[PDB]
């Protein structure tokens, strides 16, 4: 279950550079440039890039 992003701030600590990274990955996901690799569950793309932050393969 997701409700807090304590985990996310731990990885990319500036709390705003987080916004930068995830946002752009979300748009590559939008455009069929790619597709999600870490299984999504209806999450909008901003949230999906955040999963790639907690898994740590993308930052």
């Amino acid at each position: 279950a997701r409700v807090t992003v304590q985990d996310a701030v731990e990885k990319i600590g500036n709390r705003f550079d987080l916004v930068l990274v995830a946002a752009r990955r979300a748009r590559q996901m939008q455009v069929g440039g790619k597709d999600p690799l870490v299984p999504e569950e209806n999450d909008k793309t901003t949230v999906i890039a955040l999963r790639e932050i907690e898994e740590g393969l993308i930052n």
Binding site: V3, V9, V19, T46, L50
Partner: protein
């Protein structure tokens, strides 16, 4: 990353003087005719403001002549009249030109009080005025004739100047002439001469001019803008798509009459060029100079000459000034700019079931707000025919689009906000939930954060459209993340009250318990016992709580344990996450208990547990609140027959005291306070009854006949949980209210006799009406001033950004527990909470570092600094930060909503502002200690006298209470001369007088023992014989030296202290002659030859704190009677009497001896001329000047002094806010400094401290040894700091934009868009926050790469 080769973005931005050649770079055609129509057919005039050759395309890719229409045409022109077939959108970017001829001067910069042209030419503005209105022939390129360069000449006299000077001379009039002078203004030749006069003239009437003149001249060197460009040659034409043409439907013009203005500008333009062709006389072509000049004026602000009306109409010509100076500069940024889309201003409602991460939004509202996304979805997928049919689907409310509505909302977060919100904690985010209704629901407990009750809080819930904002919502703006206040590291939301009484009823003890003794192995079957109904929720059950503790490296260790707990607490475990131990939840649970309860779950287990835990709590809080049952009882509000008894006494008593008045013993006033007196005691006695009644009276049977428990009386439950029922509110319903304030503000001797729960009358009521109406008035005003306070606050801090993390300095300040009066007011820990130790701090054990230099002091380290005996800790301050133009993460710390290292991009400036102005709405005898310690005398010479007692010879006297523990506890400020019972190292009892003085007499005492001889003291000319018929004690009272005689005024009476022989005694401690110069009205107590003791009383000398006061601190308002600071360590003597003052001659010991101060004897001085006062010693009394505390005592001294004081104001408010913010504001007020050393810039320039910081930086290094100017810190007020703004983008906002026009326009101040405010009016990412790395790439792409 490398600087990208392709054009991704653009960069930093500047302003300065360029070239008309640059205007030729934007040149697309020249406007010839002012006519926009044919007067016949209303068709658009070519070669006019709406030309096709110049401008062009009206239709997408269009040749206006009517040859190329199709959008295939790109760039191909109408060869006859060049119409490049392009975007009519690009016709909003079409700039033209019109060759002038009439030199356009700057009458704006002339009539400008800040006389730009005036002190630019070093010519009096009045005479320069004579020149431009063309009535004075100014001399240009002159010098060694009869006249100089700075001089005029009237018409006929210049005619004589021709008959006298037909050669080697020329003087023409106006801007024409002035352009000649700008053409010859040689900066550096004047520069030499300026610094020449810098060493020659030594008057401020001459050298102040000097310092800014040289400044402004090298400022042009600084920007390479020559004064030549002040004469307009080629005029820029605004794009047609920018001065809209829309005739009024019928035959009139509803157009922007700016066209009707440029119309005249173009008329007169061609006119003077025609007066070049035909060569008309000078006086009239220069008359046209003035004519084209007003054209310029009429466009702007009609100049400032008078607003000439329009064609036969009561209507000044139109003003683009009233287009660039309205409010906050322009009208987006002004009040009323925009009105948010993708939002909804709607009323609110509870919704007790909403998860902590979600809010409720109405279905109808939903449709209206997400349609574009709904259509974006309906055609990106393609479930709708067309977007028009899509509109028709929502037109029919078709179920299909509501499912697409589910696609645009179910994980699309929203932001929320209220109108009255002044704090940042009032802007949060949640996730939407589709509720069928009309009101925005919410999670109950968050309302307290917005400080929003249910009285009409209409919220505008915003929608984060972009990917960025959506994540930013769920990021920093998520409710579940800002569970801490940026003011203090405590959980911002405390369980309200409904929730707490529910759990007060959960973890609870009652003597009659069903199942009181059984045992369980699982909190889950506990559920099956009470939620079923077979057991009570209070039975004392022995259960095995196999609690857990993350004592491992992240693993919750398994530890078995059984507790004598109550049924509800077992069920409370079903709530409490394993990581959190059962010990903390084996408590009755109060509002404050449950407060720190959630906080511990955070510091220990984490945030995630705590968040979903508080979530659990919310549901079960209200859950068992229902299961509670017991709510209110009339049978509980019983009045003791003791109340009626004490009122009977309270009657008879004052009835007798009123008879004492009819007897004359007590006075009206003494009986006034006396009534107060006994009713106070009477009320406390009734209190001693109603409170114990409501504490032990519930006595239910259990293992006997009866046995007590804490009153189950509901009102007491609110007095135990401490939710919304306090001992005073209780005393105000079931007891006598007490004494009330009168309409005057003082106190009426008589209280509200009975109780409100029963009965009073309207007179009692009027007393009470005062108080009620009182609170009301307060809210009604405080609110408005708070926003205005934070207004000036942002007006001073906005651009302060943390830009580094570590600087390179050990320097910090001293954090100390402000132990004043009794025990400490504000301890050590809370000031250190969230900072970093300055240096390697030692323990009381020397050279044993308990905390290395660079270490972040958080929870554990704060606990650490509380265990050690260390009491004074030097911590790195935000004002001592080595980082210029910002602060380092270290000097700041970590405390905010977060608890981590402050970021590079986090602008502390603005958040400091709001959090200091957040509590703005809120702002409005002997010494016998009752504790046990020991007197530790500090900074005082105490001497033993007869009877082995002890006395004090100074006013500087702190009384310490070193306990058996050791910690200094109580601290009393003892007056001049007192009776001490202890010395340094003798223990105090519980209720013992340790210092006993007289509040109505200030005794001056001797330190030695010996005979007193009156010297230079005569009865009738210095002293007087006041041996009354009432007294018997012989004494010569020293009168003041203004009541004396002629030859009497010239002296200061001397009390000689001789020994047992008759010789001047030298003082043991100080080599001083014993000749006490006595002041006035000092009634001595002896005759001649009276041997004094060593510490005996010689003579007798009979004798807002809120918002406005804090406003005083921050406006740096100089108080009325300042306690003048002694500017030097040195012995002092006196001088001169009545004339106007009383001189104070101070004689420094090792410093500059000419330090003396003229002080009015009209003011009360207390300086002992036998005492060598220090540089930081009050000479007189009353509020002191922080300015001198700033310089005479030190910046770090004053920064620490004021933060103490203002924090004490927050102590009257009980609010705890970390001084980090208040100290960055202090740094702000000291960002300018009056230079002392000459050489580089000035000898007194109030200039930016960090600016001069980099000056001296590369001054002790490159090119020089030392020649640079050195400053003395100058402190300012915030409304003057807001007035001292450099960047025009922020200045033009609140200061007069026209002021700002001049202010930076002539200097061409190239401010590369380095500030936040700037970034926002251009609509671009600031170089901080999310625009940090953005502009990082941008900054190294600007002037670098």
């Amino acid at each position: 990353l490398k600087a990208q080769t392709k054009t991704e973005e653009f960069d930093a931005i500047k302003i300065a003087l360029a070239s008309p050649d640059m205007i030729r770079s934007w040149s697309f055609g020249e406007v010839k005719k002012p006519e926009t129509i044919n007067y016949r057919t209303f068709k658009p005039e070519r070669d006019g403001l709406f030309c096709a050759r110049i401008f062009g395309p009206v239709k997408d890719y269009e040749c206006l002549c009517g040859k190329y229409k199709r959008l295939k045409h790109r760039g191909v022109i109408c060869e006859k009249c060049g119409v490049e077939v392009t975007q009519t959108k690009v016709r909003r970017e079409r700039m033209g030109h019109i060759e002038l001829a009439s030199p356009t001067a700057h009458i704006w910069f002339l009539k400008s009080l800040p006389s730009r042209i005036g002190l630019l030419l070093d010519m009096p503005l009045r005479d320069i005025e004579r020149v431009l209105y063309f009535e004075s022939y100014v001399v240009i390129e002159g010098g060694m004739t009869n006249l100089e360069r700075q001089q005029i000449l009237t018409e006929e006299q210049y005619l004589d100047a021709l008959e006298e000077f037909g050669d080697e001379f020329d003087a023409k009039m106006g801007a024409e002439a002035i352009q000649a002078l700008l053409k010859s203004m040689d900066l550096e030749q004047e520069c030499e001469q300026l610094r020449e006069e810098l060493n020659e003239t030594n008057s401020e009437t001459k050298r102040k001019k000097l310092t800014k003149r040289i400044k402004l001249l090298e400022a042009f060197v600084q920007s390479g803008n020559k004064p030549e460009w002040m004469i307009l040659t080629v005029l820029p034409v605004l794009p047609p798509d920018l001065r809209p043409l829309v005739p009024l439907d019928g035959g009139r013009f509803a157009t922007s009459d700016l066209n009707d203005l440029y119309r005249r500008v173009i008329n007169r333009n061609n006119r003077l060029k025609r007066l070049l062709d035909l060569a008309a006389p000078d006086i009239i072509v220069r008359n046209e100079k003035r004519m084209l000049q007003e054209a310029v004026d009429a466009l702007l602000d009609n100049g400032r000459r008078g607003r000439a009306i329009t064609g036969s109409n009561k209507r000044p010509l139109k003003s683009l000034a009233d287009m660039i100076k309205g409010k906050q500069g322009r009208f987006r940024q002004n009040l009323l700019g925009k009105r948010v889309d993708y939002s909804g201003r709607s009323v609110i409602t509870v919704g007790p079931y909403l998860r902590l991460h979600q809010c409720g939004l109405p279905k109808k509202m939903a449709l209206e707000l997400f349609k574009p996304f709904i259509y974006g979805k309906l055609e990106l997928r393609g479930l709708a025919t067309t977007i028009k049919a899509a509109k028709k689907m929502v037109e029919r409310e078709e179920a299909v689009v509501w499912d697409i509505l589910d696609e645009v909302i179910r994980e699309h977060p929203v932001l929320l906000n209220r109108a009255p919100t002044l704090h940042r904690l009032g802007i949060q985010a949640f996730e939407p939930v589709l509720i069928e209704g009309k009101a925005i629901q919410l999670h109950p407990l968050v309302c307290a954060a917005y400080n929003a009750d249910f009285d009409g809080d209409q919220m505008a819930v915003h929608v984060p459209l972009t990917l960025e904002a959506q994540l930013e919502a769920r990021a920093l703006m998520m409710s579940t993340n800002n569970i801490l206040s940026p003011a203090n590291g405590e959980p911002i939301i405390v369980p309200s009250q409904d929730v707490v009484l529910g759990l007060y009823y959960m973890t609870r003890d009652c003597v009659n318990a069903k199942g009181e003794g059984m045992v369980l192995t699982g909190p889950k079957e506990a559920e099956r016992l009470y939620r079923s109904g077979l057991a009570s929720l209070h039975a004392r059950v022995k259960v095995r709580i196999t609690e857990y503790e993350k004592d491992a490296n992240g693993e919750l260790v398994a530890k078995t344990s059984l507790k004598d707990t109550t049924v509800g607490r077992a069920i409370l475990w079903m709530i409490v996450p394993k990581g959190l131990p059962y010990s903390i939840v084996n408590q009755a649970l109060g509002k404050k208990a449950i407060s720190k309860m959630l906080n511990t779950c955070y510091r220990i287990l984490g945030l995630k547990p705590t968040v979903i835990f508080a979530d659990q709590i919310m549901y079960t809080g209200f859950a068992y609140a229902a299961r509670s049952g017991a709510s209110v009882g009339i049978d509980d509000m019983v009045i003791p027959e003791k109340k009626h008894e004490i009122i009977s006494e309270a009657e008879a008593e004052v009835a007798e005291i009123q008879e004492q008045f009819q007897s004359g013993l007590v006075t009206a006033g003494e009986r006034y306070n006396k009534v107060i007196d006994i009713w106070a005691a009477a009320n406390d006695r009734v209190s001693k009854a109603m409170m114990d009644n409501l504490q032990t009276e519930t006595v239910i049977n259990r293992d006997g006949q009866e046995e007590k428990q804490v009153s189950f009386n509901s009102i007491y439950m609110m007095a135990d949980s401490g939710a919304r029922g306090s001992a005073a509110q209780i005393r105000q319903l079931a007891g006598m209210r007490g004494l009330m304030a009168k309409p005057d503000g003082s106190i009426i001797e008589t209280p509200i006799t009975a109780n409100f729960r029963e009965g009073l009358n309207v007179l009692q009521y009027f007393i009470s009406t005062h108080g009620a109406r009182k609170g009301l008035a307060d809210t009604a005003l405080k609110t408005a001033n708070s926003g205005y306070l934070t207004r000036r606050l942002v007006d001073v801090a906005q651009d302060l950004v943390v830009t580094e993390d570590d600087c390179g300095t050990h320097e910090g300040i001293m954090m100390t527990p402000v132990i004043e009066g009794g025990d400490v007011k504000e301890p050590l820990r809370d000031r250190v909470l969230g900072r970093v130790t300055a240096e390697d701090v030692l323990k009381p054990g020397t050279a044993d570092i308990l905390v290395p230099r660079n270490t972040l002091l958080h929870e554990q380290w704060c606990d650490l600094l509380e265990e050690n005996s260390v009491d004074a800790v030097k911590v790195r301050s935000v004002v001592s930060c080595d980082t210029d133009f910002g602060v380092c993460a270290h000097c700041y710390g970590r405390d905010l909503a977060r608890g981590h290292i402050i970021n590079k991009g986090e602008a502390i400036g603005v958040i400091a502002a709001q959090s200091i102005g957040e509590p703005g709405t809120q702002l409005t005898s002997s010494i016998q200690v009752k504790n046990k310690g020991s007197i530790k005398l500090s900074n005082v010479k105490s001497v033993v006298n007869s009877s082995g007692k002890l006395v004090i010879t100074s006013r500087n006297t702190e009384l310490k209470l070193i306990d058996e523990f050791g910690r200094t506890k109580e601290s009393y400020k003892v007056p001049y001369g007192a009776v001490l019972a202890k010395g340094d190292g003798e223990q105090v009892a519980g209720g013992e007088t340790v210092a006993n003085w007289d509040p109505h007499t200030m005794p001056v005492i001797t330190e030695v023992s010996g005979f007193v001889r009156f010297t230079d003291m005569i009865d009738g000319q210095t002293i007087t014989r006041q041996t009354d018929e009432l007294t018997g004690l012989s004494s010569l009272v020293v009168l003041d030296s203004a009541e004396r005689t002629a030859g009497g005024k010239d002296l200061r009476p001397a009390l000689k202290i001789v020994d047992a022989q008759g010789n001047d005694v030298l003082i043991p401690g100080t080599d001083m002659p014993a000749q006490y110069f006595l002041p006035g009205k000092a009634i001595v107590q002896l005759e001649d030859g009276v041997q004094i003791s060593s510490g005996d009383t010689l003579a007798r000398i009979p004798q807002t704190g809120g918002l406005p006061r804090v406003a005083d601190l921050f406006e740096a308002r100089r108080p009325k009677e300042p306690a003048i600071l002694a500017e030097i360590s040195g012995i002092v003597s006196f001088g001169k009497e009545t004339k106007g003052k009383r001189r104070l001659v101070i004689t420094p010991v090792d410093g500059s001896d000419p330090y003396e101060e003229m002080i009015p004897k009209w003011r009360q001085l207390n300086v002992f001329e036998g005492e060598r006062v220090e540089r930081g010693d009050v000479i007189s009394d009353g509020p002191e000047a922080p300015h001198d505390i700033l310089r005479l005592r030190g910046v770090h001294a004053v920064t620490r002094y004021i933060v103490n004081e203002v924090q004490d104001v927050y102590r009257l408010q009980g609010v705890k806010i970390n001084d980090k913010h208040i100290e960055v504001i202090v740094r702000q007020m000291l960002r300018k400094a009056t230079i002392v050393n000459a050489g580089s810039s000035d000898f007194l320039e109030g200039e930016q401290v960090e600016y001069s910081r980099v000056k001296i930086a590369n001054r002790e290094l490159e090119a020089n040894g030392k020649v640079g100017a050195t400053y003395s810190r100058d402190l300012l007020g915030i409304t003057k700091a807001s007035l001292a703004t450099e960047s025009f983008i922020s200045a033009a906002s609140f200061q007069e934009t026209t002021r700002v026009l001049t202010e930076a326009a002539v200097a061409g101040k190239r401010d590369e868009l380095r500030g936040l405010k700037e970034n926002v009016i251009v609509g671009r990412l600031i170089p901080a926050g999310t625009g940090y790395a953005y502009h990082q790439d941008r900054m190294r792409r600007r002037a670098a790469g």
